Each structure stands twice: as structure tokens, then as C-alpha cells.
Structure 1
Amino acid sequence: KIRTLQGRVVSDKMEKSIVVAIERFVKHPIYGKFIKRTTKLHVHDENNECGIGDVVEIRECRPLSKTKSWTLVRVVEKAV
């Protein structure tokens, strides 16, 4: 039972943290067009191994800071 998210690294500046963006398509409730929506998550990156632009697999965990409730599971693709 390993619920997980996949997204790409938009910021790697913070010490041991990263900002990840999860993008998805969604049907528009009224006009039916499929629209891009993005969800940015502050995620934990102990060891700072995640570079900007990387594609990373993340999971939900307990609060790590005022805004971090997610941590890194592993890198998928890097340095496009």
C-alpha cells in the first residue's frame, strides 16, 4: 500500500527541501474543455539529491514544517 505522486522539480534552492509541481488534465465542469491544472507541493529532500528539472516520485508523510507534509521517495529522470 504505497500511495504516491509524480511531478517535476521547479525549485531546489532550499536546504533539504524542494518544490515539486504535479500537473494533470481536468475536464472543465461547465464547458467541457480539458484544462491543465498544477499542484505545487513543498517536499522533503534530505541529502538534497534532487536537481531542478528532475522528475521525481514523492509520498505523503507527517508534517515536517509549516508547509511540508511530503517527502521524497526517489528520482525518476534528470538533467533534461
Structure 2
Amino acid sequence: KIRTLQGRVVSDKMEKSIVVAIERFVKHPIYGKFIKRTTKLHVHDENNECGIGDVVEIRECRPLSKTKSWTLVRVVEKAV
């Protein structure tokens, strides 16, 4: 069992890389209402098949590349 985060693709313009916006819905550090604060992350993808507007699941390693440690483990749903 692995602990994995989900998000939406925001760029795919790289033959081995994507950019993802994580579905991070959290309570504010000093206020009580839950808010969207979606992390924009650089993620490894060696199938190069998913594109902008897709829904994805990610796992953490290991540092993989420059300032990157997360990789694609499931394409959850296609655009639109």
C-alpha cells in the first residue's frame, strides 16, 4: 500500500515531463473554513501519452531530476 496524491495536468510540453496541479483542499493555518491551495508540481512521465486537462495520480521516490522527486503512477481520467 502506497500513499499517493491526485491532481490535474496544466502543461505536457516536454518529451519526458509534465506539470500537475494537486487537488489540495485544506483548512487555513489561522481560519476555520476549508480552501483550495493547489500545489503546482513538476512530475516525471516516461510514457509521454497524457496531456493538458487530464487527471493523474503521483508517488514520491528518491530525487529523480533537478528539484523533482515525484512520478506518474496512474492516469485517473481523460480530458474533457
TM-score bracket for the superposition, by shorter chain length: 0.7 to 0.9
- The corresponding residue for 1:19 is 19
1:30-76 deviations in whole A, cap 9, x for unaligned? 33232211112211110202111100111111111112201111201
Q: What is the percentage of aligned positions where both structures have the same residue?
A: 100
Moved more, 4-13 or 20-29: 20-29
* Aligned-residue RMSD, C-alpha: 1.3
| Cα distance in 2 between the residues matched to 1:3 and 1:28 | 23
SS in 1 for 2:47: helix
- The corresponding residue for 2:44 is 44
1:13-45 deviations in whole A, cap 9, x for unaligned? 122100111022222233323221111221111
> Structure 1: which 5+ runs fail to align?
none
Q: What TM-score comes out, normalization by structure 2 length?
A: 0.87
| Cα distance in 2 between the residues matched to 1:70 and 1:54 | 17
How many equivalent pairs are there? 80
Q: Which runs of 4+ in 1 moved over 4 A?
A: none
Q: What TM-score comes out, normalization by structure 1 length?
A: 0.87
Alpha-carbon deviation of 1:78? 0.7
| Cα distance in 2 between the residues matched to 1:3 and 1:31 | 27
